[PDB]
Amino acid sequence: KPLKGFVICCTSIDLKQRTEISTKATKLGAAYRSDFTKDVTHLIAGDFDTPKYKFAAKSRPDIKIMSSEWIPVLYESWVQGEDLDDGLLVDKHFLPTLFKCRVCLTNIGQPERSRIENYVLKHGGTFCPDLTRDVTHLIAGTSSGRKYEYALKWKINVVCVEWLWQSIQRNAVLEPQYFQLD
Amino acid sequence: GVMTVPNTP
């Protein structure tokens, strides 16, 4: 049982895939949890914007946040008879740090703007030069201007750039209230 | 009343 000792929980995984992941994980030797219990070791996440993800990032940084592809790929490799690496593909299927983030900026000059786009791309997010209603985070130098006012109207998170640096350090999207502008 | 707020020129 390669996943002996692993305890897997899901968040923002569709019911069909959740069933697939639970069964394959259990057949690989893992335990499966519907609720986020203390013994969970891996959180398979389809989104950052859920109570379970927020709980992991805030209170359980020991827990590994995984993409939905991890268990299907590991399972197939295992039943195909291939010799599993001792890491069990975990290092290849961490959820990208800024997965599903769509990051826009305002009131920050060059080259800082160019560097921010570079880090958003390297850490798995989408960079948005124009504010749209689907942006998830507006990094603002000041709480003023057109992008900022439409972010308020569109209910978009407005954060200071430390949100980006600390999320990158943590390998998880941190919550926005911790990075609200003064 | 806009689709986007364009990147600051």
mmCIF file of C-alpha atoms in Angstrom:
data_model
loop_
_atom_site.group_PDB
_atom_site.id
_atom_site.type_symbol
_atom_site.label_atom_id
_atom_site.label_comp_id
_atom_site.label_asym_id
_atom_site.label_seq_id
_atom_site.Cartn_x
_atom_site.Cartn_y
_atom_site.Cartn_z
ATOM 1 C CA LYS A 1 0.000 0.000 0.000
ATOM 2 C CA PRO A 2 1.975 3.000 -1.270
ATOM 3 C CA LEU A 3 -0.362 5.510 0.438
ATOM 4 C CA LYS A 4 -0.272 3.809 3.830
ATOM 5 C CA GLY A 5 -0.271 6.623 6.386
ATOM 6 C CA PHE A 6 -1.771 9.183 3.984
ATOM 7 C CA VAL A 7 -5.069 10.815 4.949
ATOM 8 C CA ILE A 8 -6.800 12.578 2.074
ATOM 9 C CA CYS A 9 -9.520 15.238 2.076
ATOM 10 C CA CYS A 10 -11.034 17.107 -0.879
ATOM 11 C CA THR A 11 -12.317 20.639 -1.398
ATOM 12 C CA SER A 12 -13.990 22.089 -4.501
ATOM 13 C CA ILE A 13 -13.809 18.746 -6.324
ATOM 14 C CA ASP A 14 -16.919 17.775 -8.282
ATOM 15 C CA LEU A 15 -18.834 14.789 -6.882
ATOM 16 C CA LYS A 16 -17.932 12.446 -9.755
ATOM 17 C CA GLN A 17 -14.206 13.129 -9.433
ATOM 18 C CA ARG A 18 -14.447 13.034 -5.630
ATOM 19 C CA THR A 19 -15.791 9.471 -5.868
ATOM 20 C CA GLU A 20 -12.978 8.517 -8.243
ATOM 21 C CA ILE A 21 -10.316 10.094 -6.027
ATOM 22 C CA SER A 22 -11.671 8.582 -2.802
ATOM 23 C CA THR A 23 -11.805 5.064 -4.258
ATOM 24 C CA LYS A 24 -8.396 5.195 -5.941
ATOM 25 C CA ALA A 25 -6.765 6.717 -2.848
ATOM 26 C CA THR A 26 -8.299 4.051 -0.601
ATOM 27 C CA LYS A 27 -7.248 1.290 -2.997
ATOM 28 C CA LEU A 28 -3.723 2.758 -2.867
ATOM 29 C CA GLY A 29 -3.824 2.408 0.942
ATOM 30 C CA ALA A 30 -4.859 5.893 2.081
ATOM 31 C CA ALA A 31 -7.617 6.934 4.441
ATOM 32 C CA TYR A 32 -10.273 9.287 3.077
ATOM 33 C CA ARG A 33 -12.030 12.045 5.020
ATOM 34 C CA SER A 34 -15.223 13.874 4.131
ATOM 35 C CA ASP A 35 -14.730 16.413 6.920
ATOM 36 C CA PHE A 36 -11.420 18.191 7.462
ATOM 37 C CA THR A 37 -10.197 16.153 10.433
ATOM 38 C CA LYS A 38 -7.043 16.561 12.517
ATOM 39 C CA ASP A 39 -5.356 13.554 10.899
ATOM 40 C CA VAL A 40 -5.651 14.857 7.320
ATOM 41 C CA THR A 41 -2.265 14.975 5.568
ATOM 42 C CA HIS A 42 -3.189 16.014 2.015
ATOM 43 C CA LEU A 43 -5.889 18.407 0.833
ATOM 44 C CA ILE A 44 -6.836 17.892 -2.807
ATOM 45 C CA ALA A 45 -8.191 21.255 -3.889
ATOM 46 C CA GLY A 46 -9.964 22.566 -6.964
ATOM 47 C CA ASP A 47 -10.145 26.170 -5.712
ATOM 48 C CA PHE A 48 -8.610 28.373 -3.022
ATOM 49 C CA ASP A 49 -11.945 30.024 -2.173
ATOM 50 C CA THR A 50 -13.380 27.446 0.243
ATOM 51 C CA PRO A 51 -13.507 27.054 4.042
ATOM 52 C CA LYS A 52 -11.345 23.904 3.901
ATOM 53 C CA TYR A 53 -8.596 25.563 1.869
ATOM 54 C CA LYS A 54 -8.712 28.657 4.081
ATOM 55 C CA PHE A 55 -8.407 26.459 7.156
ATOM 56 C CA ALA A 56 -5.370 24.618 5.756
ATOM 57 C CA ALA A 57 -3.552 27.833 4.790
ATOM 58 C CA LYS A 58 -4.320 29.574 8.106
ATOM 59 C CA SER A 59 -4.045 26.749 10.645
ATOM 60 C CA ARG A 60 -2.479 23.620 9.064
ATOM 61 C CA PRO A 61 0.588 24.608 7.009
ATOM 62 C CA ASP A 62 1.890 21.053 7.516
ATOM 63 C CA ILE A 63 -0.848 19.788 5.185
ATOM 64 C CA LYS A 64 0.097 19.439 1.522
ATOM 65 C CA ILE A 65 -2.291 21.044 -0.956
ATOM 66 C CA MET A 66 -2.591 18.816 -4.033
ATOM 67 C CA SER A 67 -4.087 19.111 -7.490
ATOM 68 C CA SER A 68 -6.999 16.918 -8.558
ATOM 69 C CA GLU A 69 -4.675 15.092 -10.990
ATOM 70 C CA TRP A 70 -2.390 13.619 -8.323
ATOM 71 C CA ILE A 71 -4.374 10.529 -7.326
ATOM 72 C CA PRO A 72 -5.547 9.561 -10.855
ATOM 73 C CA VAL A 73 -1.985 9.824 -12.227
ATOM 74 C CA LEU A 74 -0.437 7.971 -9.276
ATOM 75 C CA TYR A 75 -3.136 5.289 -9.381
ATOM 76 C CA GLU A 76 -2.724 4.628 -13.113
ATOM 77 C CA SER A 77 1.057 4.434 -12.768
ATOM 78 C CA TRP A 78 0.630 1.977 -9.883
ATOM 79 C CA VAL A 79 -1.845 -0.364 -11.555
ATOM 80 C CA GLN A 80 0.226 -0.229 -14.755
ATOM 81 C CA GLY A 81 2.941 -1.949 -12.710
ATOM 82 C CA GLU A 82 5.462 0.886 -12.853
ATOM 83 C CA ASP A 83 7.808 1.207 -9.869
ATOM 84 C CA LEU A 84 6.642 4.169 -7.803
ATOM 85 C CA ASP A 85 9.204 6.719 -6.683
ATOM 86 C CA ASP A 86 9.324 7.040 -2.894
ATOM 87 C CA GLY A 87 7.860 10.550 -3.225
ATOM 88 C CA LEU A 88 4.806 9.017 -4.948
ATOM 89 C CA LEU A 89 4.621 11.919 -7.428
ATOM 90 C CA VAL A 90 3.631 14.380 -4.666
ATOM 91 C CA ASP A 91 6.308 16.905 -5.654
ATOM 92 C CA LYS A 92 4.988 16.873 -9.238
ATOM 93 C CA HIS A 93 1.321 17.527 -8.332
ATOM 94 C CA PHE A 94 1.301 20.184 -5.633
ATOM 95 C CA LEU A 95 -1.436 22.674 -6.402
ATOM 96 C CA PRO A 96 0.251 25.721 -7.986
ATOM 97 C CA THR A 97 0.590 28.440 -5.380
ATOM 98 C CA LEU A 98 -1.590 31.004 -7.184
ATOM 99 C CA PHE A 99 -3.890 28.512 -8.943
ATOM 100 C CA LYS A 100 -7.060 30.229 -10.254
ATOM 101 C CA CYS A 101 -5.833 33.637 -9.068
ATOM 102 C CA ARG A 102 -6.385 36.419 -11.602
ATOM 103 C CA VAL A 103 -4.194 39.265 -10.418
ATOM 104 C CA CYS A 104 -4.549 42.893 -11.488
ATOM 105 C CA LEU A 105 -2.451 45.894 -10.325
ATOM 106 C CA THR A 106 -2.947 49.625 -9.818
ATOM 107 C CA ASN A 107 -0.887 52.654 -8.757
ATOM 108 C CA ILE A 108 2.427 50.770 -8.839
ATOM 109 C CA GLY A 109 5.160 51.921 -11.189
ATOM 110 C CA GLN A 110 7.677 50.231 -13.440
ATOM 111 C CA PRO A 111 9.635 47.959 -13.098
ATOM 112 C CA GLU A 112 7.601 46.750 -10.096
ATOM 113 C CA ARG A 113 4.624 46.060 -12.383
ATOM 114 C CA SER A 114 6.745 43.947 -14.703
ATOM 115 C CA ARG A 115 8.276 42.003 -11.802
ATOM 116 C CA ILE A 116 4.847 41.324 -10.276
ATOM 117 C CA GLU A 117 3.551 39.873 -13.559
ATOM 118 C CA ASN A 118 6.682 37.698 -13.706
ATOM 119 C CA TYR A 119 6.055 36.221 -10.244
ATOM 120 C CA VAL A 120 2.319 35.761 -10.802
ATOM 121 C CA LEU A 121 3.113 33.709 -13.918
ATOM 122 C CA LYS A 122 5.917 31.676 -12.349
ATOM 123 C CA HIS A 123 3.745 30.765 -9.364
ATOM 124 C CA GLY A 124 0.771 29.554 -11.371
ATOM 125 C CA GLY A 125 -1.646 32.488 -11.568
ATOM 126 C CA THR A 126 -3.014 34.661 -14.353
ATOM 127 C CA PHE A 127 -1.853 38.237 -14.755
ATOM 128 C CA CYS A 128 -4.493 40.759 -15.829
ATOM 129 C CA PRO A 129 -3.348 44.140 -17.201
ATOM 130 C CA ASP A 130 -6.995 45.290 -17.345
ATOM 131 C CA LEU A 131 -9.451 45.000 -14.480
ATOM 132 C CA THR A 132 -12.351 42.684 -15.289
ATOM 133 C CA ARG A 133 -15.205 41.318 -13.205
ATOM 134 C CA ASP A 134 -13.363 37.958 -13.000
ATOM 135 C CA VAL A 135 -10.191 39.339 -11.377
ATOM 136 C CA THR A 136 -9.690 37.754 -7.927
ATOM 137 C CA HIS A 137 -7.075 40.113 -6.459
ATOM 138 C CA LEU A 138 -6.281 43.757 -7.128
ATOM 139 C CA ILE A 139 -2.853 44.677 -5.794
ATOM 140 C CA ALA A 140 -3.092 48.416 -5.106
ATOM 141 C CA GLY A 141 -0.392 50.929 -4.280
ATOM 142 C CA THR A 142 -3.043 53.320 -2.930
ATOM 143 C CA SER A 143 -6.759 53.091 -2.215
ATOM 144 C CA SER A 144 -7.680 55.422 -5.059
ATOM 145 C CA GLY A 145 -8.248 55.563 -8.798
ATOM 146 C CA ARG A 146 -10.444 53.912 -11.392
ATOM 147 C CA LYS A 147 -9.304 50.284 -11.017
ATOM 148 C CA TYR A 148 -9.727 50.597 -7.254
ATOM 149 C CA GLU A 149 -13.244 52.027 -7.433
ATOM 150 C CA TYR A 150 -14.427 49.344 -9.844
ATOM 151 C CA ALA A 151 -12.842 46.684 -7.641
ATOM 152 C CA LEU A 152 -15.087 47.888 -4.803
ATOM 153 C CA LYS A 153 -18.103 47.961 -7.116
ATOM 154 C CA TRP A 154 -17.271 44.467 -8.408
ATOM 155 C CA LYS A 155 -16.598 42.982 -4.921
ATOM 156 C CA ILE A 156 -12.982 42.179 -5.841
ATOM 157 C CA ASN A 157 -10.310 41.669 -3.160
ATOM 158 C CA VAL A 158 -8.071 44.737 -2.813
ATOM 159 C CA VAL A 159 -4.747 43.797 -1.208
ATOM 160 C CA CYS A 160 -1.299 45.271 -0.671
ATOM 161 C CA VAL A 161 1.590 43.584 -2.482
ATOM 162 C CA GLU A 162 2.617 41.647 0.647
ATOM 163 C CA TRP A 163 -0.344 39.372 -0.146
ATOM 164 C CA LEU A 164 1.616 38.229 -3.207
ATOM 165 C CA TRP A 165 5.007 37.875 -1.487
ATOM 166 C CA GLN A 166 3.591 35.993 1.512
ATOM 167 C CA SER A 167 1.416 33.710 -0.634
ATOM 168 C CA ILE A 168 4.492 32.847 -2.698
ATOM 169 C CA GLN A 169 6.482 32.129 0.463
ATOM 170 C CA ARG A 170 3.697 29.973 1.878
ATOM 171 C CA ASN A 171 2.903 28.032 -1.323
ATOM 172 C CA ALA A 172 -0.783 28.851 -0.725
ATOM 173 C CA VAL A 173 -3.189 31.691 -1.418
ATOM 174 C CA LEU A 174 -3.494 33.676 1.794
ATOM 175 C CA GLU A 175 -6.741 35.391 2.703
ATOM 176 C CA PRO A 176 -7.150 39.049 1.689
ATOM 177 C CA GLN A 177 -8.233 40.654 4.979
ATOM 178 C CA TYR A 178 -4.705 40.084 6.316
ATOM 179 C CA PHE A 179 -3.387 42.443 3.596
ATOM 180 C CA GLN A 180 -5.958 45.227 3.519
ATOM 181 C CA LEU A 181 -4.646 48.710 2.855
ATOM 182 C CA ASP A 182 -4.650 51.202 5.725
ATOM 183 C CA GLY B 1 -21.036 50.324 -17.248
ATOM 184 C CA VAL B 2 -17.708 49.149 -18.612
ATOM 185 C CA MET B 3 -16.472 45.695 -19.546
ATOM 186 C CA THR B 4 -12.954 46.463 -18.291
ATOM 187 C CA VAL B 5 -10.872 49.106 -16.624
ATOM 188 C CA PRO B 6 -7.898 49.326 -19.015
ATOM 189 C CA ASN B 7 -4.307 49.116 -17.819
ATOM 190 C CA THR B 8 -3.068 52.529 -16.683
ATOM 191 C CA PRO B 9 -1.181 54.062 -19.645
#
